Scaffold this active site. Structure first.
Site, PDB file in Angstrom:
ATOM      1  N   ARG A  57      48.107  59.676  39.000  1.00  0.00           N
ATOM      2  CA  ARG A  57      46.838  59.141  39.748  1.00  0.00           C
ATOM      3  C   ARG A  57      47.252  58.786  41.017  1.00  0.00           C
ATOM      4  O   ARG A  57      48.278  57.997  41.250  1.00  0.00           O
ATOM      5  CB  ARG A  57      46.441  58.097  38.944  1.00  0.00           C
ATOM      6  CG  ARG A  57      45.282  57.226  39.561  1.00  0.00           C
ATOM      7  CD  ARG A  57      44.757  56.037  38.704  1.00  0.00           C
ATOM      8  NE  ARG A  57      43.645  55.339  39.672  1.00  0.00           N
ATOM      9  CZ  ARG A  57      43.770  54.181  39.868  1.00  0.00           C
ATOM     10  NH1 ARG A  57      44.572  53.463  39.305  1.00  0.00           N
ATOM     11  NH2 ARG A  57      42.831  53.625  40.500  1.00  0.00           N
ATOM     12  N   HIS A  85      40.855  53.779  47.567  1.00  0.00           N
ATOM     13  CA  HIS A  85      41.735  52.511  47.219  1.00  0.00           C
ATOM     14  C   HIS A  85      42.001  51.660  48.223  1.00  0.00           C
ATOM     15  O   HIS A  85      43.228  51.686  48.638  1.00  0.00           O
ATOM     16  CB  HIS A  85      43.129  53.345  46.482  1.00  0.00           C
ATOM     17  CG  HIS A  85      43.748  52.407  45.375  1.00  0.00           C
ATOM     18  ND1 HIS A  85      44.292  52.535  44.074  1.00  0.00           N
ATOM     19  CD2 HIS A  85      44.403  51.026  45.734  1.00  0.00           C
ATOM     20  CE1 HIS A  85      45.045  51.663  43.507  1.00  0.00           C
ATOM     21  NE2 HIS A  85      44.870  50.900  44.403  1.00  0.00           N
ATOM     22  N   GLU A  91      38.611  49.200  41.710  1.00  0.00           N
ATOM     23  CA  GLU A  91      38.406  47.753  41.536  1.00  0.00           C
ATOM     24  C   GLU A  91      37.499  47.226  42.531  1.00  0.00           C
ATOM     25  O   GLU A  91      37.874  46.490  43.417  1.00  0.00           O
ATOM     26  CB  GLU A  91      39.917  46.940  41.575  1.00  0.00           C
ATOM     27  CG  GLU A  91      40.845  47.480  40.442  1.00  0.00           C
ATOM     28  CD  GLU A  91      42.259  46.787  40.626  1.00  0.00           C
ATOM     29  OE1 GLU A  91      42.422  46.053  41.746  1.00  0.00           O
ATOM     30  OE2 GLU A  91      42.826  46.756  39.475  1.00  0.00           O
ATOM     31  N   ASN A 114      41.862  48.904  34.330  1.00  0.00           N
ATOM     32  CA  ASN A 114      43.101  48.372  34.796  1.00  0.00           C
ATOM     33  C   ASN A 114      43.421  47.256  34.067  1.00  0.00           C
ATOM     34  O   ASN A 114      42.323  46.295  33.958  1.00  0.00           O
ATOM     35  CB  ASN A 114      43.226  48.011  36.269  1.00  0.00           C
ATOM     36  CG  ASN A 114      43.190  49.663  36.914  1.00  0.00           C
ATOM     37  OD1 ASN A 114      43.308  50.473  36.362  1.00  0.00           O
ATOM     38  ND2 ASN A 114      43.149  49.143  38.271  1.00  0.00           N
ATOM     39  N   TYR A 173      46.614  43.770  33.346  1.00  0.00           N
ATOM     40  CA  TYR A 173      48.015  43.269  33.663  1.00  0.00           C
ATOM     41  C   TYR A 173      48.162  41.894  32.831  1.00  0.00           C
ATOM     42  O   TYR A 173      49.094  41.934  32.294  1.00  0.00           O
ATOM     43  CB  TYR A 173      48.109  43.066  35.021  1.00  0.00           C
ATOM     44  CG  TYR A 173      48.127  44.265  36.000  1.00  0.00           C
ATOM     45  CD1 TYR A 173      46.965  45.102  36.169  1.00  0.00           C
ATOM     46  CD2 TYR A 173      49.527  44.870  36.417  1.00  0.00           C
ATOM     47  CE1 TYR A 173      47.276  46.196  37.093  1.00  0.00           C
ATOM     48  CE2 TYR A 173      49.432  46.014  37.168  1.00  0.00           C
ATOM     49  CZ  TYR A 173      48.449  46.739  37.636  1.00  0.00           C
ATOM     50  OH  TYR A 173      48.584  47.839  38.276  1.00  0.00           O
ATOM     51  N   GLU A 223      45.751  51.459  35.103  1.00  0.00           N
ATOM     52  CA  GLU A 223      46.877  50.841  35.555  1.00  0.00           C
ATOM     53  C   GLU A 223      47.101  50.004  34.636  1.00  0.00           C
ATOM     54  O   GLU A 223      46.459  49.347  33.901  1.00  0.00           O
ATOM     55  CB  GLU A 223      46.519  50.235  36.765  1.00  0.00           C
ATOM     56  CG  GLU A 223      46.170  51.042  37.977  1.00  0.00           C
ATOM     57  CD  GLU A 223      45.975  50.048  39.261  1.00  0.00           C
ATOM     58  OE1 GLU A 223      46.407  48.980  39.336  1.00  0.00           O
ATOM     59  OE2 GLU A 223      45.388  50.845  40.047  1.00  0.00           O
TER      60      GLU A 223
HETATM   61  O1  GI4 Z   1      43.533  42.727  40.084  1.00  0.00           O
HETATM   62  C1  GI4 Z   1      44.167  43.179  39.182  1.00  0.00           C
HETATM   63  O2  GI4 Z   1      44.333  42.157  38.188  1.00  0.00           O
HETATM   64  C2  GI4 Z   1      44.614  44.284  38.405  1.00  0.00           C
HETATM   65  C3  GI4 Z   1      45.644  45.173  39.673  1.00  0.00           C
HETATM   66  C4  GI4 Z   1      46.853  45.061  39.650  1.00  0.00           C
HETATM   67  N1  GI4 Z   1      47.135  45.890  40.856  1.00  0.00           N
HETATM   68  C5  GI4 Z   1      45.916  46.451  41.196  1.00  0.00           C
HETATM   69  N2  GI4 Z   1      45.089  46.096  40.480  1.00  0.00           N
HETATM   70  C6  GI4 Z   1      45.777  47.459  42.335  1.00  0.00           C
HETATM   71  O3  GI4 Z   1      44.914  48.589  41.827  1.00  0.00           O
HETATM   72  C7  GI4 Z   1      47.216  48.138  42.737  1.00  0.00           C
HETATM   73  O4  GI4 Z   1      46.757  48.648  43.895  1.00  0.00           O
HETATM   74  C8  GI4 Z   1      48.265  46.852  42.701  1.00  0.00           C
HETATM   75  O5  GI4 Z   1      49.513  47.275  43.476  1.00  0.00           O
HETATM   76  C9  GI4 Z   1      48.449  46.542  41.320  1.00  0.00           C
HETATM   77  C10 GI4 Z   1      49.621  45.364  41.219  1.00  0.00           C
HETATM   78  O6  GI4 Z   1      49.011  44.098  41.979  1.00  0.00           O
END
Ligand code: GI4
Length: 437
Positions: A75, A119, A164, A288, A290, A343
């Site tokens: 990706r 992006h 996002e 995505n 995290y 992600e």
């Molecule tokens: O906003 C969130 O919770 C989820 C997120 C993490 N991340 C993103 N989204 C973005 O797509 C990436 O470009 C960032 O590098 C990565 C780490 O911060």
């Protein structure tokens, strides 16, 4: 063992501004991240994307790393102002050539390209005309997308309109922490709405241009849990910060109920006039994920509650069950035909040991846990077709600059040396085995 479905797409992910460098090379126009990062005070340490990982020059080496790891999908995103330096009108052949070489190389090596059209590196020329605040961006974005489809749609078959759009609108135009660095709630909600309109127009053009291939859209998501049993604040955070803000328009033709309660006055007066168009059929949803968050009502009437849980170098709480929850929830709420985890990853304070290796067991533990929860969701019927690690490489982490390392490959910025981390080696074994053991 935990084995995934046959042909499951194991991937890694990057974005153009974060890895490429050379933002003004070969006729490219400035992006809003170029101008935002060159404005003092916006990015930690005054860091910019001027050099980053020098992927603009080292792209072949990086792809050879993907190949050698046996990763099946990549990706990556395309820089709009490399393709159309003024945003609309003139097309830059050298910009197309750069991505053409990447696409052909990936295909030659049997790696599936997943292209993110946007992006975050909006052409500066379009920001001067209001950027995502201007309704005309649905046209500008459709013209841009059409160029990519005409040039690459013969080879690239998997497309993502937006990365996002919540972050683009809210972090960029309300919090002012990302480009274009604004703080106006009315602008931020008009950006939300125009991001939806632009996405739908691009999908409409796709159906007209690329007979074969699939298109979707990517959302950020957190796992919100309530601080007590008194729950609605969690409800609002889900509907506002997660996929429902966009999927409720796409599947149902209106914003979620609690978003309208908070934000009706900030949306255009006749926003519903655009909803029939916004319902343009999509092929997959990218999620995505995290971090998880403990949330309470607080007189947006929401505050976060710090928990004593393991955290990453971002200070993000590690809550692996969250990736299972969001996958179950997306099926339950909108039942999209295909889902991808586009992600998942973590930042840790990586160090190269005297043995020349990067022993990131913390990152292995993080990925393993989340992959395990994703496997579970599949066993329970979620049509998850793939999973992408953020990121192949340590890179420019937006307003944090180079201070946060998310790669499964370490980059020594002084030399541009790539060192595959222990997590990279571990992941390659997962992909080869099609799962965990
Ligand atoms: O906003 C969130 O919770 C989820 C997120 C993490 N991340 C993103 N989204 C973005 O797509 C990436 O470009 C960032 O590098 C990565 C780490 O911060």
């Amino acid at each position: 063992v935990k084995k995934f479905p046959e042909g499951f797409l194991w991937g890694v992910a990057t974005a153009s501004y974060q890895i490429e460098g050379s933002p003004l090379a070969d006729g490219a126009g400035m992006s809003i991240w170029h101008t935002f990062s060159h404005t003092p005070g916006n990015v930690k340490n005054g860091d910019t994307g001027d050099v980053a990982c020098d992927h603009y020059n080292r792209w072949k080496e990086d792809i050879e790393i993907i190949e050698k790891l046996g990763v099946k999908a990549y990706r990556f995103s395309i820089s709009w102002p490399r393709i159309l330096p003024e945003g609309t009108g003139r097309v830059n052949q050298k910009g197309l050539d750069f991505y053409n070489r990447i696409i052909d190389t990936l295909l030659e090596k049997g790696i599936t390209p997943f292209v993110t059209i946007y992006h975050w590196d909006l052409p500066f020329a379009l920001q001067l005309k209001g950027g995502w605040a201007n309704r005309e961006i649905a046209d500008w974005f459709a013209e841009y997308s059409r160029v990519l489809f005409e040039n690459f749609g013969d080879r690239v078959k998997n497309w993502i309109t937006l990365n996002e759009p919540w972050v683009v609108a809210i972090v960029g135009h309300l919090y002012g922490v990302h480009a274009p660095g604004m703080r106006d709630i009315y602008v931020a909600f008009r950006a939300v709405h125009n991001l939806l309109r632009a996405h739908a127009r691009a999908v409409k053009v796709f159906r007209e241009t690329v007979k074969d291939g699939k298109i979707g859209i990517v959302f950020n998501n957190g796992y919100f849990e309530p601080a007590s049993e008194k729950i609605r604040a969690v409800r609002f955070m889900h509907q506002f910060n997660n996929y429902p803000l966009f999927l409720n328009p796409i599947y149902r033709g209106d914003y979620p109920e609690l978003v309208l309660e908070f934000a009706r006055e900030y949306l255009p007066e006749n926003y519903k006039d655009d909803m029939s168009e916004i319902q343009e059929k999509i092929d997959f949803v990218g999620l995505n994920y995290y971090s998880g968050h403990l949330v309470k009502f607080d007189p947006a009437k929401v505050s976060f509650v710090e928990r004593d849980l393991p955290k990453t170098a971002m200070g993000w709480e590690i809550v692996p069950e969250g990736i299972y929850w969001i996958l179950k929830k997306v099926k339950e709420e909108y039942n999209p035909p295909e889902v991808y985890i586009t992600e998942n990853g973590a930042a840790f304070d990586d160090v190269v040991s005297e043995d020349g290796r990067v022993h990131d067991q913390n990152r292995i533990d993080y990925l393993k846990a989340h992959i395990g929860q994703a496997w579970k969701a599949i066993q329970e019927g979620v049509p998850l077709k793939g999973y992408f690690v953020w990121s192949l490489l340590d890179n420019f982490e937006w307003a944090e600059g180079y201070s946060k390392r998310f790669g499964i490959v370490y980059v020594d910025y002084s030399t541009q040396k790539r060192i595959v981390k222990d997590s990279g080696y571990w992941y390659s074994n997962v992909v080869k085995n099609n799962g965990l053991e």
